[PDB]
A paper describes a structure:
Here, we identify two O-methyltransferases from tea plant: CsFAOMT1 that has a specific O-methyltransferase activity on the 3ʹʹ-position of EGCG to generate EGCG3′′Me, and CsFAOMT2 that predominantly catalyzes the formation of EGCG4″Me. To explain the specificity of CsFAOMT1 and CsFAOMT2, we crystallized both in the presence of EGCG and S-adenosyl-L-homocysteine (SAH), a by-product of the cofactor SAM and determined the structures at a resolution of 2.0 Å for CsFAOMT1 and 2.0 Å for CsFAOMT2. The electron densities for SAH and Mg2+ are unambiguously assigned, but EGCG was not found in either structure. The structural overlap of the monomers of CsFAOMT1 and CsFAOMT2 revealed a root mean square deviation of 0.36 Å over the Cα atom of 190 aligned residues, with the most striking difference occurring in an α-helix (α9) near the substrate binding pocket.
In vitro, enzymatic assays with recombinant CsFAOMT2 protein confirmed that CsFAOMT2 has mainly 4″-O-methyltransferase activity on EGCG and a lower 3″- O-methyltransferase activity. In CsFAOMT1, this α-helix is bent toward the pocket, creating a deep and narrow cleft for substrate binding, whereas in CsFAOMT2 the corresponding α-helix is bent in the opposite direction, resulting in a relatively open and shallow pocket. Two sequence variable residues were identified subsequently: CsFAOMT1-L50 (CsFAOMT2-M50) and CsFAOMT1-Y184 (CsFAOMT2-R184). Consistently, CsFAOMT2-R184Y led to significant increase of 3″-methylation activity and moderate decrease of the ability to methylate the 4″-position of EGCG, and the 3″- and 4″-O-methylation activities of CsFAOMT2-R184Y were decreased by 58% and 54% when M50L mutation was combined in CsFAOMT2, respectively. However, in CsFAOMT2, this residue is mutated to a hydrophobic valine (V49), which makes it possible to accommodate 5″-OMe and leads to the production of dimethyl EGCG. Notably, the side chains of arginine are known to be more flexible than those of tyrosine, meaning that EGCG may bind in a more dynamic manner at the active site of CsFAOMT2 and CsFAOMT1-Y184R mutant, thus conferring them 3″- and 4″-O-methylation activity. The Km values, 95.79 μM for CsFAOMT1 and 20.88 μM for CsFAOMT2, indicated that CsFAOMT2 has a stronger affinity to EGCG than CsFAOMT1. In addition, the kcat/Km value of CsFAOMT2 (6762.45 s−1 M−1) was higher than that of CsFAOMT1 (3830.57 s−1 M−1), suggesting that CsFAOMT2 has higher catalytic efficiency. Additionally, two trace amounts of di-methylated EGCG products (EGCGdi-Me1 and EGCGdi-Me2) were observed in the reaction solution and further validated by LC–MS/MS analysis. Moreover, 3′,5′-dimethyl ether (syringetin) and 3′,4′-dimethyl ether were obtained with myricetin as substrate, which means that CsFAOMT2 could modify myricetin on all the 3′-, 4′-, and 5′-positions of the B ring.
Numbering used by the authors: 8 to 138, 143 to 236
Write the structure that this text describes.
Amino acid sequence: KTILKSEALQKYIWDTSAYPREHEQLKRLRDATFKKYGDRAVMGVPPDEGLFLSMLLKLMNAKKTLEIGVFTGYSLLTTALALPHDGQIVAIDPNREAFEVGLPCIQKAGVEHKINFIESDAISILNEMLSLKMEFDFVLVDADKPNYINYHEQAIKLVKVGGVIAYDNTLWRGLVVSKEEEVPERFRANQKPIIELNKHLASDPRVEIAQISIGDGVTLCRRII
Ligand SMILES: Nc1ncnc2c1ncn2[C@@H]1O[C@H](CSCC[C@H](N)C(=O)O)[C@@H](O)[C@H]1O
Ligand SMILES: [Mg+2]
């Protein structure tokens, strides 16, 4: 899976620059995910995106973060490894089984303590958090795309001024543009909420944005008010 010119170019990045710098337990988590879910493992954050997130977290001096959507935990383990010793992550996903695929790797890496995994749909947890308000340096959104705009309007209140909200899938499979037509039910579930998110973020004066053509598309939003 890639949004790049060729599969060979994507593999070149991984072979040259990501795999040689990838923590052993991140590799093991990827392999466990492929073994369990087969081609569904595509849903996970890929290794070049992971190494990018890791550097971003360090450059930002992030310490407290929020993850909306976890799956088997590739981005979660990436984040826990990148944060300082006193880092803490709140990570929300209704699928505890998927989390438990990655958990042994998280544990062997020694970073389980940095993670508060919450088995829930995210909206209800975020609503409760917004009902002292918790504050985060960084938020990663990689979950159910029809809710991404709704997550933005909660996350913009939970991230600190100067902090970052990152959205995965903002160039979803390269299919946000297409010469072919998509069928209504699939369009409404996938391309449409991303096309709409992208307009929403571009129009939001409360953030600065940078859409990055890495992974499945990552849009960084820096909160300015
Ligand atoms: N309402 C909801 N709230 C939080 N997570 C949800 C959700 N609906 C679906 N999801 C989750 O979003 C996930 C998307 S895949 C997340 C990928 C992950 N960041 C990685 O690196 O592997 C699935 O695990 C799914 O359970
Ligand atoms: Mg997703």
